[PDB]
């Protein structure tokens, strides 16, 4: 037997759609669709953050372990695309909880925080700019 089985997984993904909750548009979520999301999403640095973290394949046996409120672009992005948020504030707070997880589970001067530094700077650049 051994524990060999059952294996590792990787958690149910943030929900993107959850028809009770309340939502709207909003001109200042417009904007962080059309220019804050889609410039960070075609940044250099982004590709790691695009997606759920998919601890399985990247060997992060440990990420879900210290991370308990996971968060990324890849969610932020649909749930923009289908209108989940009341407001701004909302969407703000999960771009800064997935940086904050980035920060959490890494070491300051890895590279990884190196790319999440750079892409929160770009985001807060972005965010003074708001309606
Ligand atoms: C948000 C995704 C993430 N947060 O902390 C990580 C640590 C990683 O490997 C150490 C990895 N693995 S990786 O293969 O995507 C990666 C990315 C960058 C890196 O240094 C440049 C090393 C591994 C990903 C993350």
Same mark, same amino acid.
């Given at each position: 037997?051994?524990?060999?089985?059952? %294996?590792?997984?990787?958690?149910?993904?943030? *929900?993107?759609?959850?028809?009770?909750?309340?939502?709207?548009?909003?001109?200042?979520?417009?904007?962080?669709?059309?220019?804050?999301?889609?410039?960070?999403?075609?940044?250099?640095?982004?590709?790691?953050?695009?997606?759920?973290?998919?601890?399985?394949?990247?060997?992060?046996?440990?990420?879900?372990?210290?991370?308990?409120?996971?968060?990324?672009?890849?969610?932020?992005?649909? %749930?923009?695309?289908?209108?989940?948020?009341?407001?701004?504030? *909302?969407?703000?707070?999960?771009?800064?909880?997935?940086?904050?997880?980035?920060?959490?589970?890494?070491?300051?001067?890895?590279?990884?925080?190196?790319?999440?530094?750079?892409?929160?700077?770009?985001?807060?650049?972005?965010?003074?700019?708001?309606?």
């Amino acid at each position: 037997h051994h524990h060999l089985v059952p %294996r590792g997984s990787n958690p149910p993904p943030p *929900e993107t759609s959850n028809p009770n909750k309340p939502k709207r548009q909003t001109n200042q979520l417009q904007y962080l669709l059309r220019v804050v999301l889609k410039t960070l999403w075609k940044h250099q640095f982004a590709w790691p953050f695009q997606q759920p973290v998919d601890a399985v394949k990247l060997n992060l046996p440990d990420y879900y372990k210290i991370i308990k409120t996971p968060m990324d672009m890849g969610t932020i992005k649909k %749930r923009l695309e289908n209108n989940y948020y009341w407001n701004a504030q *909302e969407c703000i707070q999960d771009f800064n909880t997935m940086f904050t997880n980035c920060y959490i589970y890494n070491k300051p001067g890895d590279d990884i925080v190196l790319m999440a530094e750079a892409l929160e700077k770009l985001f807060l650049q972005k965010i003074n700019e708001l309606p």
